[PDB]
Design a protein around this ligand. Structure first.
Ligand code: FE
Length: 488
């Protein structure tokens, strides 16, 4: 390093979080006016697939970092009349612009601003986790701060979005939902009054941005609430056993720490209710709640479907003794939780809906919060062939794109070959008439031995047959986090 002097950018680390087809940095802001398509893209698909990826503008100041900490890079694939175009742009966060001003990374440990350079922006957010259309803009979200608005067509950054000053929490979820009956934005905040606070808030916003209802209450301790579930009548907050200690953070340590002897906790509250209506339920220890597939309620009972994993998958938030289990050890599958508000019992056990591990679930947007029978999922089957030119098996490697029928319990999956894996899918209805889950499943396919990327389109009526269309991208797309479909 010394012979590089002080005027070069420092090298990226040679760690797994910066290596291979999935995690090597890209940093490409791009416009591709027309994409090559193999196969036949249905001409009736009309709208934009937005996705956000962490994609660090600079090598991290500390010489190491986690995937979840990268500057948000939003892609929009716009589908019209059989043609697809791509725009990819950074969210111009205060954090990004400060780093660009200095020409280097100014930010330290994930969600620990005490370890930043004093020239870092005050707002620590990277707006890197999800995207959703709301009130005429695209919101780029990350759960440590308010979201950042972008122009739906150009992906120009509009600024921090405060919802016309109505949202008074310190943070806003990256897992809001759109209510399919009203178009309301259903959202929440944890650590809602600052670092380490136990405050939780539910928010409900009209499609035109008006705050319709809020419910402030407190958890028994500060914990990660990554995703949530909203039904017709209830909201459920899953508190993952990852706890916050501000003193540990002042000393340079991680924002969260896994607690292996702390029950999974759920707060269940009426959607139009108040703090005093909150009820708490407890699940097993040493397990953690994945992303919500869907949820609904009927009579006394709230049902929530999600992956549940039997131990700490977050190696960067280790328990106090430093131990982290080998990810391969951990039992995971899709589960249904049932919260019976009329029962005597606080204690819940999740019931399996699959016998295989999976993540990145997607239901039909039109059935969010309602009784439903279908989900799309990514899964990893370790017995499928794996081309050794892929390199070592990366974090968030999923070699199957799956349609699960909840009525029969059967799965219909596409395997893309031994050099392929997937990013989070979206579902596009075949028409506004179409029955539940009848349409197209669209996802990025990473061809990791070639370091190439395609956006694939499958027909939900026959997933095993593979793509009806493969949209070739002329550069490698880094692994992403969440995306959404915005219908024209
Ligand atoms: Fe998420």
């Amino acid at each position: 390093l010394v012979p590089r002097g002080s005027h070069m950018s420092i090298p990226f680390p040679q760690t797994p979080e910066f290596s291979g087809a999935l995690y090597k940095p890209s940093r490409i802001e791009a416009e591709v006016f027309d994409l090559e398509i193999e196969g036949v893209l249905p001409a009736s698909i009309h709208g934009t697939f937005y996705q956000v990826a962490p994609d660090p503008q600079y090598p991290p100041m500390l010489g190491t970092d986690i995937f979840f900490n990268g500057d948000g890079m939003v892609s929009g694939f716009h589908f019209a009349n059989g043609k697809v175009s791509l725009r990819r742009r950074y969210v111009q966060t205060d954090r990004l612009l400060a780093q660009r001003r200095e020409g280097r990374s100014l930010n330290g440990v994930y969600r620990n601003a005490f370890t930043n350079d004093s020239l870092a922006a005050k707002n620590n957010t990277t707006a890197n986790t999800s995207v959703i259309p709301h009130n005429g803009v695209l919101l780029a979200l990350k759960e440590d701060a308010l979201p950042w608005a972008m122009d739906l067509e150009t992906l120009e950054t509009l600024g921090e979005w405060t919802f016309d000053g109505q949202i008074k929490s310190a943070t806003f979820t990256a897992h809001p939902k759109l209510d399919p009956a009203t178009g309301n934005l259903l959202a929440f905040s944890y650590e809602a009054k600052g670092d380490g606070t136990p405050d939780l808030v539910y928010f409900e916003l009209s499609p035109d941005g008006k705050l319709l209802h809020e419910i402030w209450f407190q958890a028994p301790y500060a914990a990660m609430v990554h995703d949530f579930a909203a039904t017709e009548r209830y909201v459920v907050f899953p508190l993952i056993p990852l706890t916050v200690d501000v003193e540990r953070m002042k000393n340079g340590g991680p924002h969260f720490q896994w607690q292996p002897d702390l029950p999974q906790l759920f707060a269940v509250v009426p959607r139009n209710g108040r703090a005093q209506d909150v009820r708490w339920f407890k699940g097993p220890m040493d397990g953690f709640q994945g992303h919500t597939l869907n949820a609904f309620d009927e009579d006394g009972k709230v049902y929530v479907d999600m992956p549940v994993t039997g131990g700490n998958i977050f190696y960067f938030f280790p328990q106090a003794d430093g131990h982290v289990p080998p990810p391969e050890t951990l039992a995971a599958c899709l589960m249904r939780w049932t919260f019976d508000l009329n029962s005597g019992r606080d204690e819940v056990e999740p019931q399996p809906l699959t016998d295989y591990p999976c993540e990145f679930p997607r239901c039909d947007d039109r059935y969010i919060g309602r009784q439903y029978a279908h989900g799309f999922l990514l899964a990893f089957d370790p017995e499928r062939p794996y081309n050794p030119a892929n390199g070592p098996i990366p974090f968030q490697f999923f070699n199957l794109l799956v349609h699960l029928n909840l009525k029969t319990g059967l799965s219909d999956a596409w395997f893309p070959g031994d050099s392929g894996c997937f990013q989070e899918p979206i579902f596009i209805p075949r028409s506004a008439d179409a029955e539940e889950a009848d349409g197209y499943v669209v996802a990025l396919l990473n061809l990791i031995a070639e370091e190439r990327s395609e956006l694939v389109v499958l027909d939900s009526r026959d997933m095993a047959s593979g793509p009806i269309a493969r949209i070739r991208i002329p550069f490698r797309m880094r692994m992403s986090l969440h995306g959404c479909w915005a219908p024209g």
